[PDB]
Amino acid sequence: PQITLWKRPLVTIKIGGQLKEALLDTGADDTVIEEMSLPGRWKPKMIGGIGGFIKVRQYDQIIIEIAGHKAIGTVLVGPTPVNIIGRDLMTQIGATLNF
Amino acid sequence: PQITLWKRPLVTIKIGGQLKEALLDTGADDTVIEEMSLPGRWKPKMIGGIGGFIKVRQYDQIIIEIAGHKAIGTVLVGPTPVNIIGRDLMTQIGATLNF
Numbered sequence A, B: 001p002q003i004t005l006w007k008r009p010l011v012t013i014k015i016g017g018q019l020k021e022a023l024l025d026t027g028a029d030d031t032v033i034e035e036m037s038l039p040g041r042w043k044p045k046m047i048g049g050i051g052g053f054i055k056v057r058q059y060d061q062i063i064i065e066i067a068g069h070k071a072i073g074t075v076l077v078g079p080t081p082v083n084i085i086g087r088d089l090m091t092q093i094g095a096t097l098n099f
């Protein structure tokens, strides 16, 4: 759909069979989800944001539904202030910025 | 225009008489520009994201041109790793997320 930006672009996602709310973040290269149990093997990764760097668990090829759209890709799990859907998955659902 | 998300959505902006590259960030409530000697008064603010918080100076009614589109609003100036155009200004240029 078309999402304006007067409110945070929050969407419902389904990951690991669990529903969550996440923010479509064009400023995120990656997808970072709050600490949770996720089925699959993972690798320790460090990612940076506005305030610094954090350690995350990198899960590859994770199936996730974002606003009713399917994406299968890298999901980082860690102490992020909010669940964020980055460009790696936004490109999968055909999301573009327009003005 | 339409901006795909294969790459970081960087656009040219003009603020305080300077041209800079900024990231269109739908996950940013506010706009934060790299440290620059902007005149006028401001008030201290702390903004956070992945990794923690950074202290910035908050300037109100700052005019910024984003990819040729004029906007006027609140701009935070501080030690940000990249110039970020948030929702407060993206709404002014009529930017939407589409998929």
Ligand SMILES: CCCC[C@H](NC(=O)[C@H](C)NC(=O)[C@H](CCC(=O)O)NC(=O)[C@H](Cc1ccccc1)NC[C@H](CC(C)C)NC(=O)[C@@H](NC(=O)[C@@H](N)CCCNC(N)=[NH2+])C(C)C)C(N)=O
Pocket: A023, A025, A027, A028, A029, A030, A031, A032, A045, A046, A047, A048, A049, A050, A081, A082, A084, A086, B023, B025, B027, B028, B029, B030, B031, B032, B046, B047, B048, B049, B050, B081, B082, B084
């Ligand atoms: C081996 C490579 C591994 C990959 C790894 N990649 C990264 O770290 C890349 C660059 N990081 C990013 O792209 C990260 C997101 C995490 C991620 O994608 O991994 N992006 C980001 O963190 C971008 C800004 C940014 C972009 C690029 C570089 C640096 C910074 N911000 C994302 C973020 C989303 C938010 C909901 C948590 N928004 C914000 O941080 C903004 N914050 C907000 O909008 C609010 N929290 C308001 C602040 C609080 N207000 C207050 N106290 N009154 C801020 C910019 C004003 C590399 N570093 O190591």
